[PDB]
Design an enzyme around this catalytic site. Structure first.
Site, PDB file in Angstrom:
ATOM      1  N   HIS A 288       0.768  -1.314   0.006  1.00  0.00           N
ATOM      2  CA  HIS A 288       0.162   0.068  -0.261  1.00  0.00           C
ATOM      3  C   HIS A 288       0.880   1.165   0.157  1.00  0.00           C
ATOM      4  CE1 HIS A 288       0.018  -0.177   4.622  1.00  0.00           C
ATOM      5  NE2 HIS A 288      -0.009   1.107   4.529  1.00  0.00           N
TER       6      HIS A 288
ATOM      7  N   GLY B 137       2.157   6.425   9.862  1.00  0.00           N
ATOM      8  CA  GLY B 137       3.688   6.145   9.492  1.00  0.00           C
ATOM      9  C   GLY B 137       4.202   4.917   9.857  1.00  0.00           C
TER      10      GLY B 137
ATOM     11  N   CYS C 226       3.396   1.822   9.330  1.00  0.00           N
ATOM     12  CA  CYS C 226       3.274   0.607   8.529  1.00  0.00           C
ATOM     13  C   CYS C 226       4.693   0.470   7.988  1.00  0.00           C
ATOM     14  CB  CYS C 226       2.240   1.144   7.387  1.00  0.00           C
ATOM     15  SG  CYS C 226       0.801   1.558   7.652  1.00  0.00           S
TER      16      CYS C 226
HETATM   17  O1  LIG Z   1      -0.389   5.020   8.859  1.00  0.00           O
HETATM   18  C1  LIG Z   1      -1.292   4.556   8.988  1.00  0.00           C
HETATM   19  C2  LIG Z   1      -1.784   4.436  10.430  1.00  0.00           C
HETATM   20  C3  LIG Z   1      -1.733   2.992  11.132  1.00  0.00           C
HETATM   21  C4  LIG Z   1      -1.771   2.542  12.369  1.00  0.00           C
HETATM   22  O2  LIG Z   1      -1.861   1.592  12.812  1.00  0.00           O
HETATM   23  N1  LIG Z   1      -2.470   3.696  13.085  1.00  0.00           N
HETATM   24  C5  LIG Z   1      -2.879   4.956  12.616  1.00  0.00           C
HETATM   25  C6  LIG Z   1      -3.291   5.914  13.590  1.00  0.00           C
HETATM   26  C7  LIG Z   1      -3.655   7.248  13.166  1.00  0.00           C
HETATM   27  C8  LIG Z   1      -3.354   7.460  11.886  1.00  0.00           C
HETATM   28  C9  LIG Z   1      -2.761   6.608  10.844  1.00  0.00           C
HETATM   29  C10 LIG Z   1      -2.544   5.258  11.281  1.00  0.00           C
HETATM   30  N2  LIG Z   1      -2.285   4.212   8.061  1.00  0.00           N
HETATM   31  C11 LIG Z   1      -2.142   4.489   6.571  1.00  0.00           C
HETATM   32  C12 LIG Z   1      -2.301   3.298   5.965  1.00  0.00           C
HETATM   33  N3  LIG Z   1      -3.599   2.593   6.395  1.00  0.00           N
HETATM   34  C13 LIG Z   1      -4.000   1.788   5.459  1.00  0.00           C
HETATM   35  C14 LIG Z   1      -5.588   1.751   5.000  1.00  0.00           C
HETATM   36  C15 LIG Z   1      -5.799   1.077   4.060  1.00  0.00           C
HETATM   37  C16 LIG Z   1      -5.399  -0.135   3.824  1.00  0.00           C
HETATM   38  C17 LIG Z   1      -4.060  -0.375   4.358  1.00  0.00           C
HETATM   39 CL1  LIG Z   1      -3.356  -1.952   4.144  1.00  0.00          CL
HETATM   40  C18 LIG Z   1      -3.338   0.498   5.101  1.00  0.00           C
HETATM   41  C19 LIG Z   1      -4.247   2.677   7.728  1.00  0.00           C
HETATM   42  O3  LIG Z   1      -4.691   1.910   8.137  1.00  0.00           O
HETATM   43  C20 LIG Z   1      -3.650   4.168   8.475  1.00  0.00           C
END
Ligand SMILES: O=C(c1cc(=O)[nH]c2ccccc12)N1CCN(c2cccc(Cl)c2)C(=O)C1
Ligand SMILES: O=C(c1cc(=O)[nH]c2ccccc12)N1CCN(c2cccc(Cl)c2)C(=O)C1
EC number: 3.4.19.12
Lengths: 304, 304
Positions: A41, A143, A145
């Site tokens: 992603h 961020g 991920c």
């Molecule tokens: O960086 C994050 C993020 C991850 C997290 O664990 N906690 C957060 C808390 C506050 C804001 C952002 C996050 N994201 C971007 C990608 N993302 C996503 C969205 C759709 C599909 C896929 Cl595979 C991934 C996310 O779930 C969210």
């Protein structure tokens, strides 16, 4: 003495963390040998995440669109490919800090340490378990991920998890290092149901063994039970069924304490039926299930 | 989202851990520059620990009686001296892995990470706090002495603790890196009283702020209170008095959530007076006090 949620030392994994940018998206990558592993992603824009067609999105990307930075140095990307939900970016330089490693797909109930990272830089380390519903109760922000979960066996790092997603409920979903999600989750910004989060019974029992070893013995009673009688109580309290394999696995803990596994089961049965009555076990007012019997043994024996 | 007891990445400290043997006693040492720091009780035999005269015991020891091993390599000891309860062994080689570092004496209520070690090898990392009674609720076994507590600020490791002892009650006592014990403890195998372990009020409040940020808001009520009214309740429940400095320190958490510090104080007052009623906050059935406001902010902002 003392019992804490202990993580593995993160040094070997810190040496593998890099930043991966593609377009406007930046996340973490795991650099092992001449390959950087990261969530696919990274190629999505926030608009693409509703229903991404990763093969089509990937066609528009070339090696030079993947910016990989290790510390303050840029790595040269000479190849890119998709393996399930992970991208593998071949770089021209092998990571000089690559430790001995394996990729393992863990079972639910198993524990591992997470090195939470942001922009390729490690911010913290914590211990968690793969829940029976294949989610993890992590601590991840924007961020994060690409952050990984691992175990260490002397000098060999077994990478077992890569962070990909946060569900609308605040629990976390991710893949093994071959890009296969744990659970039915897909890397799509869609309404995904986690499922019933049951309690890891063999882990609660291992923690009761650690509590006994550590002097907390108030909960021990004069009763025993059977695997079937116990499991009737366990099902009612959304606890995983205890099998003879679990009983065998608790053998060393049973031998060390002199408490038969079924006797400890009866103590847990009474704790479930009567609650803690305002008391604590190992400084906790609830039954802890994120310590496997291997973790309890390790923390009570001193394995480095 | 998610909230976990998170430790700092331990890589910088792993690179500093060595084994120190003197006679039949082996413990851990901290190698920074050309000095190895370790508990002075390394010179004691198990008989000496009842009432050791460290100056006299040390007179019988020469540089060659201190065996220092970093990995599988022996370091040459060219000097030895005692500073309070620590020995400083000057070695002929500067640690090539010495990170940027400081030695700091922390205040009670402050948190830090421990890299638990055995025979100079790191086995685990966990987060803990210096209790108001100057003990730590660690997880340490035989041979863990010399293990250190630290904080990291970007690239600078502030070493704040060195493990020395386990009290008869299972809590842990130790020194700062200048060898001064936290608390009234002495490095003697004698009956030592820890004292009343009060709850770090400003930390419980910071954790209530993290809980609110993380969606757990059941405990929030329609009440407010005053610093004096709150402290009357806090004293009864063995909670540290809350001061205007604590209120100021919670300012960023108060600003982020929109909940005034005194309103959160009233929620905590009701939680103390009425208990949790079988409910949980951030997956815990008791009030957590080992997260400072700096830790909550860091874990909720993403500082690497
Ligand atoms: O960086 C994050 C993020 C991850 C997290 O664990 N906690 C957060 C808390 C506050 C804001 C952002 C996050 N994201 C971007 C990608 N993302 C996503 C969205 C759709 C599909 C896929 Cl595979 C991934 C996310 O779930 C969210
Ligand atoms: O290695 C340990 C140890 C430390 C620990 O935290 N937990 C243990 C649990 C089981 C067995 C041993 C330990 N020791 C030896 C030195 N030692 C000591 C005794 C007297 C004085 C001084 Cl400064 C130190 C100890 O307290 C005990």
């Amino acid at each position: 003495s003392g019992f804490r949620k202990m993580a593995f030392p993160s040094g070997k994994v810190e040496g593998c963390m890099v930043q991966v940018t593609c377009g406007t998206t930046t996340l973490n990558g795991l650099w092992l040998d001449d390959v950087v592993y990261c969530p696919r992603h990274v190629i999505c824009t926030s608009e693409d995440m509703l229903n991404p067609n990763y093969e089509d999105l990937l066609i528009r990307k070339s090696n030079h669109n993947f910016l990989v930075q290790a510390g303050n140095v840029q790595l040269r990307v000479i190849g890119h490919s998709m393996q399930n939900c992970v991208l593998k970016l071949k770089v021209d330089t092998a990571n000089p800090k690559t430790p001995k490693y394996k990729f393992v797909r863990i079972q639910p109930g198993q524990t591992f340490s997470v090195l939470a990272c942001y922009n390729g830089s490690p911010s913290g380390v914590y211990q968690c378990a793969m829940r029976p519903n294949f989610t993890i109760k992590g601590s991840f922000l924007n961020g994060s991920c690409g952050s990984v979960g691992f175990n260490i066996d002397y000098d060999c790092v077994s990478f077992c998890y890569m962070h990909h997603m946060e569900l609308p409920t605040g629990v976390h979903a991710g893949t093994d290092l071959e890009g296969n999600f744990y659970g039915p989750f897909v890397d799509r910004q869609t309404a995904q149901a986690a499922g019933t989060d049951t309690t890891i019974t063999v882990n609660v029992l291992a923690w009761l063994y650690a509590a006994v070893i550590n002097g907390d013995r108030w909960f021990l009673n004069r009763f025993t039970t059977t695997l079937n009688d116990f499991n009737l109580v366990a099902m009612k309290y959304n606890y995983e069924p205890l099998t003879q394999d679990h009983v065998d696995i608790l053998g060393p803990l049973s031998a060390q304490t002199g408490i038969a596994v079924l006797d400890m089961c009866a103590s847990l049965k009474e704790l479930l039926q009567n609650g803690m009555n305002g008391r604590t076990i190992l400084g906790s007012a609830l039954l802890e299930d994120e310590f496997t019997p291997f973790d309890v043994v390790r923390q009570c024996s001193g394995v480095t």
